[PDB]
Amino acid sequence: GTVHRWRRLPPCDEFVGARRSKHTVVAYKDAIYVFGGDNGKTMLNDLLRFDVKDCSWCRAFTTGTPPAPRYHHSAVVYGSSMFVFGGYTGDIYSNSNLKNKNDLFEYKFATGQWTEWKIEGRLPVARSAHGATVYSDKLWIFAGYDGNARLNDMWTIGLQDRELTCWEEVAQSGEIPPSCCNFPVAVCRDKMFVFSGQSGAKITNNLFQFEFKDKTWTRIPTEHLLRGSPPPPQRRYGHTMVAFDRHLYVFGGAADNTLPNELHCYDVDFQTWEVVQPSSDSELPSGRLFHAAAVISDAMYIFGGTVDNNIRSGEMYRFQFS
Amino acid sequence: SREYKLVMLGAGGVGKSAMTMQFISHRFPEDHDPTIEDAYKIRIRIDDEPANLDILDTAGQAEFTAMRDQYMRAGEGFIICYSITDRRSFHEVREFKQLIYRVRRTDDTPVVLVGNKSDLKQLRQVTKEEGLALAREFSCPFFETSAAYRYYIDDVFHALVREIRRKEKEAVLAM
Ligand SMILES: Nc1nc2c(ncn2[C@@H]2O[C@H](COP(=O)(O)OP(=O)(O)O)[C@@H](O)[C@H]2O)c(=O)[nH]1
Numbered sequence: 001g002t003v004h005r006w007r008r009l010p011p012c013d014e015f016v017g018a019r020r021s022k023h024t025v026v027a028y029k030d031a032i033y034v035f036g037g038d039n040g041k042t043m044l045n046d047l048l049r050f051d052v053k054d055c056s057w058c059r060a061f062t063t064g065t066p067p068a069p070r071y072h073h074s075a076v077v078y079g080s081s082m083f084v085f086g087g088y089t090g091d092i093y094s095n096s097n098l099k100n101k102n103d104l105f106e107y108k109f110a111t112g113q114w115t116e117w118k119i120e121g122r123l124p125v126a127r128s129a130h131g132a133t134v135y136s137d138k139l140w141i142f143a144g145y146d147g148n149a150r151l152n153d154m155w156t157i158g159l160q161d162r163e164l165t166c167w168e169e170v171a172q173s174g175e176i177p178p179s180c181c182n183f184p185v186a187v188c189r190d191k192m193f194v195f196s197g198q199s200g201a202k203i204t205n206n207l208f209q210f211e212f213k214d215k216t217w218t219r220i221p222t223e224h225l226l227r228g229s230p231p232p233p234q235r236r237y238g239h240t241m242v243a244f245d246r247h248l249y250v251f252g253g254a255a256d257n258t259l260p261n262e263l264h265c266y267d268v269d270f271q272t273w274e275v276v277q278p279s280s281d282s283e284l285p286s287g288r289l290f291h292a293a294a295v296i297s298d299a300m301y302i303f304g305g306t307v308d309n310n311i312r313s314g315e316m317y318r319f320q321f322s
Numbered sequence: 323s324r325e326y327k328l329v330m331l332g333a334g335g336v337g338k339s340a341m342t343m344q345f346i347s348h349r350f351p352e353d354h355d356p357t358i359e360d361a362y363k364i365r366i367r368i369d370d371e372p373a374n375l376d377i378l379d380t381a382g383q384a385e386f387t388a389m390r391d392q393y394m395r396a397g398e399g400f401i402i403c404y405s406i407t408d409r410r411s412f413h414e415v416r417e418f419k420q421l422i423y424r425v426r427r428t429d430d431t432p433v434v435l436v437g438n439k440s441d442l443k444q445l446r447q448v449t450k451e452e453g454l455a456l457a458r459e460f461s462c463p464f465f466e467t468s469a470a471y472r473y474y475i476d477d478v479f480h481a482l483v484r485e486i487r488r489k490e491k492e493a494v495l496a497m
């Protein structure tokens with residue numbers, strides 16, 4: 001409704017789905033789809049649907065074997081299908097059977113079919129907390145944690161025909177971001193953007209762009225000091241980032257043992273940051289991390305995340321874009 | 323080869339980063355950012371047997387990063403550290419030991435208790451006997467160390483690997 005209005009939508013009921021973190025949300029038609037995560041007691045592999053226009057929750061209908069319960073996985077939408085890759089699997093309650101994954105599952109929205117894409121040939125290393133996106137009919141995987149060290153390689157796989165597709169490692173050039181995990185990925189125009197994220201000793205508030213066509217990374221410098229422009233957001237991990245119009249919107253995460261709740265906006269065309277001011281009647285959300293975000297039409301949607309003191313949330317907040 | 327993943331647990335400012343650097347590179351950090359958590363590697367020969375060590379210097383209190391989460395769950399040994407000049411950190415020792423149980427669902431995970439900053443004998447707020455008493459309560463080795471002058475730094479990590487190899491061999495006997 002109102003521009004720059006933080007609207008608090010009905011949260012997910014407990015009999016529908018458990019309040020969770022480290023999950024994935026993906027937009028299709030005019031509905032938010034939630035898969036996986038951690039409720040605090042066990043890992044999850046259910047599927048929830050939040051009709052944006054109806055403002056109603058629902059357990060999605062799924063046939064076939066779903067992916068093993070997981071969190072820190074990735075989820076993207078290609079055509080009329082959701083593609084889940086990677087993540088952590090195991091048993092939290094007993095700390096057993098714990099292992100990363102490099103499998104690829106497709107969920108046909110139309111029929112509710114869970115299909116595993118059993119890819120032959122060499123695979124990318126099983127990993128979690130990686131970045132993922134879809135561009136030029138291929139699923140792009142980047143960085144993450146494999147179980148022994150943080151990663152910074154990049155792999156692609158065609159999503160057109162599963163029978164003929166295979167994994168391809170990308171020969172990246174340019175200023176590759178250091179080994180990073182728990183970072184957001186948002187595509188804008190013909191470029192992929194990554195901001196901050198947990199990269200160990202090299203954690204910064206740097207912004208990296210990836211041009212798909214030349215497979216080159218570029219660290220966008222900030223002249224905010226010289227031109228009196230707003231400084232970039234504080235370094236953080238477990239935050240979301242979406243792209244709308246010609247702007248990136250960063251929210252949430254844990255910034256130096258703190259959970260800020262400011263909404264930061266990046267003008268990709270004017271290489272400047274901003275702190276968006278919400279409306280007077282805004283229902284501001286609390287500082288959270290390991291939540292997930294998606295964009296439907298001119299609106300951003302936030303779901304879940306650990307609010308504080310390891311309390312899992314199931315709140316649905318909606319921000320209206322200018 | 324054998325990869326031992328160890329975790330540095332302790333309250334903020336006890337000297338976790340100072341102890342790590344001294345162990346892996348024989349240096350004392352000048353102005354170390356406390357909000358930095360990363361893992362470091364070294365190959366040392368304990369009891370005439372080489373061992374690959376991967377040590378995570380923990381930082382931050384929010385929900386664990388993917389690296390930390392897997393480290394707390396798959397790490398073979400834990401080093402809980404406090405400062406002898408910080409009684410508050412000496413009390414958090416139990417909260418870290420409880421935390422290991424919440425994740426590992428067991429208290430048999432190898433642990434070494436360390437009271438750091440032993441050179442600060444002028445500002446000592448935790449007696450040496452107390453640390454030993456807490457270590458016998460935990461059934462774990464105890465060391466008073468000084469990362470500033472590298473006192474007993476090697477002995478801490480050497481001991482934990484002995485605890486790991488001891489507990490691993492006791493499992494093989496049962497099987
Ligand atoms: N004198 C002395 N100072 C220490 C020792 N260990 C740490 N410090 C100091 O205490 C401060 C905190 O150290 P740091 O390693 O960053 O603590 P951490 O947050 O647990 O990693 C630093 O300024 C160090 O100089 C020690 O063994 N002796």
Ligand SMILES: [Mg+2]
Pocket residue numbers: 338339340354355356357358379380381
């Ligand atoms: Mg430190």
